[PDB]
Amino acid sequence: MENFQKVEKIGEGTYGVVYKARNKLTGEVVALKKIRTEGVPSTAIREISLLKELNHPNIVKLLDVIHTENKLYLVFEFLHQDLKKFMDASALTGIPLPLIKSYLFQLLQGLAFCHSHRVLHRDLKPQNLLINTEGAIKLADFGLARAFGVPVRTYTHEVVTLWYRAPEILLGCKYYSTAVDIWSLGCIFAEMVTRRALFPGDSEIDQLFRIFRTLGTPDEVVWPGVTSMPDYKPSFPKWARQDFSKVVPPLDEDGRSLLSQMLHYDPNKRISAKAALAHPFFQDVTKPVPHLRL
Ligand SMILES: N#Cc1ccc(O)c(-c2ncnc(N)n2)c1
């Protein structure tokens, strides 16, 4: 727009391209996400608009919503780096455990806040987690799959990431619960620790079977109602659960215990963000400074 002198394209979210821009008037540097379409669910503009009211240190602030010319623009506070880039940058040495712990703790605080306000993220992934030089990490993107359903791509026919999708979504559950975010965060936690995606599926069924190969094919014992799920097939192969010590080595038992609770198959047994914050894994949590090269 003419109010912003674009600095450059920062990326390509599942809901449009993101740019870094400076407000010629206020001098403010912000992140501008433009959403892609001839109607524009005003019921969404309303919901989205509510999100501006979300204020928490671990949630990227939504500054403004701009509806114009069949295009929707979301103006967000800007942060210099996303966790995907940071993990890639730290791939040789690994993110120190105290930093991993600090990030997980902050992310759970952010989720506990959103969830207590009846807001689900639904598409958590490293690229959607932003960090700054002061050790903070914040949740970005957000209430969109709700206020938009679910597009088949991102915008430029880009490939949607399934790696962090909870099993109930993959099995066709039509009602997501806050548990889907805990699952995604659990996947992210594991990835920070091992430096490799936990479940790198390249299709919906491959995503599901990678989950099954590791945690065991679910059954009515561990997940009451699973065999009645929309996309459940009795023909699914039945894999034995793998010892957890093999999944996220060399993470200690407090961490493995917490992860196991975030990855429970039954959305109802899956730990809540609030309960996770009380887990013993966070007894010695601190707030370290990351080595960020911008
Ligand atoms: N949605 C959103 C959103 C909001 C604020 C942001 O700063 C970013 C972002 N995305 C990628 N890289 C960097 N540096 N920032 C994305």
Give the CATH number for residue 211. 1.10.510.10
First to last CA, the chain: 26
Domain end marker among 80, 107, 124: 80
Q: Where are the alpha helices (DSSP H) in 141-226?
A: 167-170, 179-194, 204-215
The resolution, in angstroms to one decimal, equals 1.9
The boundaries of the domain holding residue 223 are 81-291
Residue among 95, 270, 278, 122 nearest 189 (CA): 95
CA-to-CA dists, residue 269 to 33, 116, 232, angstroms: 35, 18, 19
Please tell me if the CB atom of residue 144 comes closer than 6 angstroms to any atom of ligand 1.
no
Are residues 117 and 26 part of one domain?
no
Q: Is the CB of 63 under 6 A from ligand 1?
A: no
Question: Within this chain, do residues 1 and 124 fall inside the same structural domain, yes or no?
Answer: no
Short-list 187, 114, 189, 113, CA closest to 144:
114
Q: How far apart are CA 108 and CA 225, in angstroms?
A: 28
Q: Distance between CA atoms of 215 and 238, rounded to whole angstroms? A: 11
| Active-site option among 64, 88, 123, 243 | 123
Q: DSSP assignment, residue 111?
A: H
Instruction: Classify residue 204 by its DSSP letter.
Output: H
> What's the CA gap between 13 and 34, in Å, rounded?
9
CA pseudo-torsion sign 115, 120, 125, 131: negative
Q: Is 75 in the pocket of ligand 1 (CB under 6 A)?
A: no
Strand partners, 19: 9, 32
Residue 129 zone, left/alpha/beta (φ > 0; ψ -120 to 50; rest): beta
Q: How long, in residues, is the chain? A: 294
Amino acid code (one letter) for 266? D
Q: Structural domain tally of the chain? A: 2
Q: Which of 60, 80, 100 is the last residue of a domain?
A: 80
Structure tokens at 116: 């207590």
Same domain membership, residue 143 and residue 276:
yes
* Distance separating alpha carbons of residues 143 and 212, to the nearest angstrom: 28
Measure the CA–CA gap between 115 and 267, rounded to whole angstroms. 14
Question: Residues comprising the binding site for Mg(2+)?
Answer: 128, 141
Experimental method: X-ray
Ligand 1 centroid – CA 124 distance (Å)? 13
Q: How many other C-beta atoms can be found within 10 angstroms of the C-beta atom of residue 218?
A: 23
Residues with Cβ within 8 Å of residue 274, at least 6 apart in sequence: 112, 115, 116
The answer to whether 123 is a known catalytic residue is yes
Nearest alpha-carbon partner for 125 in 208, 214, 192, 213: 192
Ligand 1 proximity of 18 Cβ (cutoff 6 Å) = yes
